[PDB]
Each structure stands twice: as structure tokens, then as C-alpha cells.
Design a protein around this ligand. Structure first.
Ligand code: 8YE
Ligand code: 8YE
Lengths: 196, 196
């Protein structure tokens, strides 16, 4: 069937990207994994690059839907926990799909569609962050220091670079078992910290 | 002469990278700019990729030497200024060589030598940051909150990603005229901010 063969292709690709990068994975490898022929592959996708775009789109929307769920239901907690739970959506969602994350970031250089997808969602997440900061200031809990959108931008770019370094075991990187605490500290201190 | 023709090659390359990426720049373009023949080019460098490595090495060492100069002579100032002056070395050095910065970051994906160069200097800068944090804690000015090396790592990765986004005018990015204040705020609040 249609959905079924498409889903097999996507599953095969996610599995193979755990062992090697996209440039070392052939359309034949994808077709063989999904139990189809090569020209049947080309009915569902034009290129192996398109398969990666679809996988990345799935993961990014997963994160975005999780964040939306959280935005609807507040945990009954203190401000530090509020931010930890939110950053954790990204830590768990992308950390549960490390191969797709790593491949997707590398594709930003060579694929205008992948760059645009990542840009679009980063803008959305920055805007949301800035809206929460603005709410915290309006209720008197956070000081009016930097422009909230500029602060949100830098904190979100920190998380993009730091999470993906950690997941890839780059040198340098924060260890994966430390990265959530590290990021939460920097978000909380910079959002709530006053000018001396 | 030897140094002279090498320097012309490097100058030509830095000029051409302002207009286009390395993949659209030929060895003939480099040789023509430097007033030499193609095989004379190959006496001084093996590839256009090697030229970029040399340019990047120059810029990274420029920044590192500037930071060393600062580490020798303290400004007579408050703590926020101490960090601003130091972050400004990177803002001015890389911001004065935007084409080389942009090309060098893109080459990290395809060049093990470029990745290793950037890794080596990031480790050095992180270690230095962490040593200053540790000094600030030992004198009683900064609280003992996160592991200083993990904090330094995330702050330095923030700056890498945020500065290069700003210089490239990426969407999203902090405007270049705002990025120094934004980064300094987040470093100062996270280094000096207490646990509530
Ligand atoms: C590979 C992860 C890329 C990434 C992570 C993040 C991130 O950690 N966040 C996006 C956010 C939008 N809102 N929040 C916290 C809101 O409480 C967010 C954190 N932004 O980009
Ligand atoms: C394209 C710039 C990449 C970059 C910038 C930085 C950076 O902003 N810094 C490196 C640092 C080492 N020490 N400091 C501040 C010390 O007072 C530093 C800031 N690290 O990597």
C-alpha cells in the first residue's frame, strides 16, 4: 500500500542513518530495506535528500506539538521548573532521534528546503520564548533588561548549538547528562537576573 | 619572491570570498589575482582548500593573540566591563573578516583540518573562560553554582553560533549592532547569578 511503503522507506532511512551519513546511503539501500524496487522508490520520493527532509519535518513537528501541549497545560510549579520542562521537550525529542538530527543539521548547508524548515521553526520557538518572557515581565517576576526578542534569539541559538554538540559527542561539548541543567541555569539567570 | 607571492594568493582569496563561496572560486581565479601562473600556484599551495585553511588559521590566531594581550593587562574596571572587553576581541576580530569566517565555518563539515583547528582553539578559549570564572569564585565575587567548565562550554558555543548568525544576517539572528550587549548580559547574569 501507499502510506505503508512510504513509512517503510522512512523507517529504513532512519535506521541506516544511525550507521552512516546520507552520502554513503544509496537509493538501492533504501529500496532494499523497504522491500521495494528502485523505480517504486522513485514513485514515493525523488531523491534520498527528500526522504531526509520528510524525516526532519516529522521530528521538528513532534517537538513543536509537544511544546504546544505544554503551552496549553501549565505545570503547577515554580518558574525554574516551567523553563526546564519546556527545554526538556527539545532535549528528549531531538535526543530520541539523534541520527535524523545530525543528518538534518548537516543538510542545512546543501538544501534550501532544509534550511528553510529549520529557520521557520526556530522563528516560531523564539517568538514563543519571547512571549513567555514578556508575560513574566508584565506580572513583575522578571526585570525589564534586554529586548525580549533579542534575548530569546541568543538563548535559542545557544540551545541549538549546545544540544547538537552534546548529542554528537563533539569536542568541545557539554556531556549529555549535564546539558539540561547547564542550559536551564543560563536561561533562568539571564531572564530573571537584574542589572547591578 | 616567496612570502610575497604567498601573501598575494591569500589576499586574492580573502577578496574573492567576499563575492562568492569557495566552490565557485577557481585555482585560475586565485592565480590570475595573484599575478602568477597556475603551476606556480601549486608550488605554494596544493588546493584552494589549503588557502582557506591558512586564512582561517591567521584569523583564529589573531583573536587568540589579542585575548592573550588582554590576559596580561587588566583594564581597571568592573566585572561587567572585563567580560565585555574580552567578548569584544571576538566580535571585532571575526567581524573584521566576515568572508573568511563564513567560509571557514562552512568548511568544518568537509575538512578534517579545519574542524580540528576550530576545535583546538575553542578548547583553549573555554579553558580560559573557566579559569577566569574559577578566579571570580575564589575571590568571592561569583557564586559556586554550575561546574565552571560546563558553564564556559555552553557560553562559548552560544557566542560561536550567535556571532556567526549575526555576521551572516541569518534569519533568525540578533542584529549585529545588538549582539555584543546581548551576549555580555547572558555571560554576566549566568556567571554572577545565584540560586534562588
Ligand atoms: C536541536 C534542538 C534545537 C533547539 C532547541 C531549542 C530549544 O531548546 N527551545 C525552543 C524553545 C521554545 N520555547 N522553549 C522554552 C519555552 O518554555 C524552547 C526551547 N530551540 O532550538
Ligand atoms: C566566531 C566567534 C567564535 C567564538 C567566540 C568566542 C568568544 O566569544 N569567546 C572566546 C573566549 C575566551 N574568553 N572569552 C572571554 C574571556 O574574558 C571568550 C569569548 N568563542 O568562540
Amino acid at each position: 500500500s501507499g502510506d505503508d511503503r512510504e513509512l517503510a522507506i522512512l523507517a529504513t532511512a532512519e535506521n541506516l542513518l544511525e550507521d552512516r551519513p546520507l552520502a554513503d546511503i544509496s537509493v538501492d539501500d533504501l529500496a532494499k530495506g523497504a522491500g521495494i524496487s528502485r523505480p517504486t522508490f522513485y514513485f514515493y520520493f525523488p531523491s534520498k535528500e527528500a526522504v531526509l527532509l520528510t524525516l526532519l519535518d516529522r521530528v521538528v513537528n513532534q517537538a513543536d506539538m509537544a511544546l504546544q501541549t505544554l503551552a496549553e497545560n501549565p505545570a503547577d510549579t515554580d518558574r525554574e521548573n516551567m523553563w526546564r520542562t519546556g527545554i526538556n521537550v527539545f532535549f528528549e525529542t531531538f535526543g530520541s532521534h539523534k541520527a535524523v538530527t545530525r543528518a538534518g543539521q548537516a543538510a542545512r548547508a546543501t538544501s534550501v528546503e532544509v534550511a528553510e524548515l529549520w529557520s521557520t521553526f526556530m522563528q516560531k520557538w523564539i517568538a514563543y520564548t519571547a512571549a513567555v518572557i514578556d508575560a513574566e515581565r508584565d506580572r513583575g517576576a522578571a526585570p525589564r533588561t534586554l529586548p525580549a526578542h533579542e534575548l530569546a534569539t541568543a538563548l535559542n541559538l545557544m540551545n541549538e548549538r549546545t544540544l547538537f554538540a552534546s548529542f554528537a559527542g563533539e569536542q568541545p561539548s557539554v556531556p549529555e547528562a549535564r546539558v539540561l541543567d547547564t542550559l536551564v541555569h543560563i536561561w533562568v539567570t539571564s531572564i530573571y537576573g537584574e542589572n547591578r
